[PDB]
């Protein structure tokens, strides 16, 4: 049905929960959930949580905390010691689950000490349902059948105009499976990717291959990048890399 019907289902779902804990990330999807809950149950029944960690840029954390305070929410940060778990630490292919389990556990621990009834996520329509459906996490946008267009159409109708546009992934995605994640090499990748991002390339991955960095750019951009070759070479060589290379196939 209409966007307005997809919304009555969202507002009806919030009133029954009366009191929620929102896992807020700053993304458009996560933002629309927080503002809607703020508009329904009030600041006293809604607690916004932004999780920082070793695997995610602190720039992202600081922007998500700030964007939440701007919405008028009571925001609380929590930091996950992801590398303490050995699955995440050794970068098994199942690592992205074990971090999500640590994530929804901490959310439910904050949810229990908070008055909140459930934990809300901001995922939408169009890889692990074994993890949300273990901590009783609710994907409210996904339940009212919101796609990315239903989300922009409702956000642009709430006057919401601020969020994080370049989306992130767990920095573990930069290391081949089997390589063990250390603070040293993790800091090294995020340092290089922060630099590439500062040259005007918001989507970039520096893949880690010991002494060789392999830069994944969107093919549309590999042309604009040549002016920065020599600087990126010096800059990434200074971060520990012996050889700085660019993947001819690009990002994705």
Ligand X SMILES: Nc1ncnc2c1ncn2[C@@H]1O[C@H](COP(=O)(O)O)[C@@H](O)[C@H]1O
Q: Are 63 and 71 in contact, with CB atoms under 8 Å apart?
A: no
CA distances from 36 to 30, 164, 192, 228 (A): 10, 18, 37, 43
Number of residues that bind ligand X (CB under 6 A): 14
User: Does residue 178 interact with its own copies by CB under 8 A?
Assistant: no
How far apart, in whole angstroms, are the C-alpha atoms of residue 249 and residue 211?
Answer: 20
How near is the Cβ of 1 to its own copies at its closest, in Å?
7
The listed partner (ligand X, its own copies, none) that binds 230, CB under 5 to 8 Å by sort, is its own copies
Residue 9 found at the interface with its own copies (CB under 8 A): no
Check binding of 212 to its own copies (CB under 8 A): yes
By DSSP bridging, strand 74-80 and strand 46-53 are parallel
Beta carbons of 208 and 215 less than 8 angstroms apart: no
161 contacts its own copies (rule: CB under 8 A): yes
Among 8, 12, 58, 70, indicate the residue that binds its own copies (CB under 8 A). Answer: 70
Residue nearest to ligand X (CB): 122
Site for ligand X in 78-117 (CB under 6 A): none
- Asked if 243 contacts 206 with a C-beta cutoff of 8 angstroms, the reply is no
44 binds, among ligand X, its own copies, none (CB under 5 to 8 A by kind): none
- Contact flags string 122-141 toward ligand X, x per CB under 6 A: xx----x-------------
Q: Is residue 144 near ligand X by the rule CB under 6 A?
A: no
What Cα–Cα distance (Å) separates residue 206 from each residue in 57, 103, 134, 235, 252? 14, 25, 33, 13, 13
**Active-site residue flag, 169:** yes
């Amino acid at each position: 049905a209409t966007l307005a019907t997809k919304k009555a289902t969202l507002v009806a779902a919030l009133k029954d929960l009366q009191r929620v804990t929102v896992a807020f990330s700053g993304g458009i999807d996560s933002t629309l959930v927080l503002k809607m809950a703020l508009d329904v149950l009030g600041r006293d029944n809604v607690t916004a949580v932004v999780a920082n960690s070793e695997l995610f840029t602190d720039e992202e954390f600081d922007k998500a905390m700030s964007l939440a305070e701007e919405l008028g929410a009571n925001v609380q940060g929590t930091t996950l010691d992801y590398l303490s778990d050995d699955h995440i630490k050794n970068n098994t292919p199942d690592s992205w689950y074990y971090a999500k389990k640590m994530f929804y556990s901490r959310l439910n621990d904050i949810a229990a000490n908070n008055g909140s009834a459930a934990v809300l996520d901001g995922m939408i329509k169009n890889p692990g349902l074994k993890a949300r459906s273990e901590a009783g996490a609710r994907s409210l946008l996904q339940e009212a059948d919101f796609f990315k267009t239903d989300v922009r159409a409702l956000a642009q109708e709430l006057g919401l105009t601020n969020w994080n546009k370049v989306a992130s992934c767990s920095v573990s995605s930069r290391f081949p499976y089997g390589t063990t994640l250390t603070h040293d090499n993790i800091a090294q990748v995020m340092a290089a990717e922060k630099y590439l991002r500062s040259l005007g390339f918001p989507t970039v991955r520096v893949r880690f291959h010991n002494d060789i960095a392999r830069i994944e750019l969107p093919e549309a951009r590999i042309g604009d990048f040549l002016v920065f070759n020599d600087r990126v070479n010096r800059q990434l060589q200074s971060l520990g890399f012996r050889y700085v290379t660019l993947d001819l196939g690009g990002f994705r």
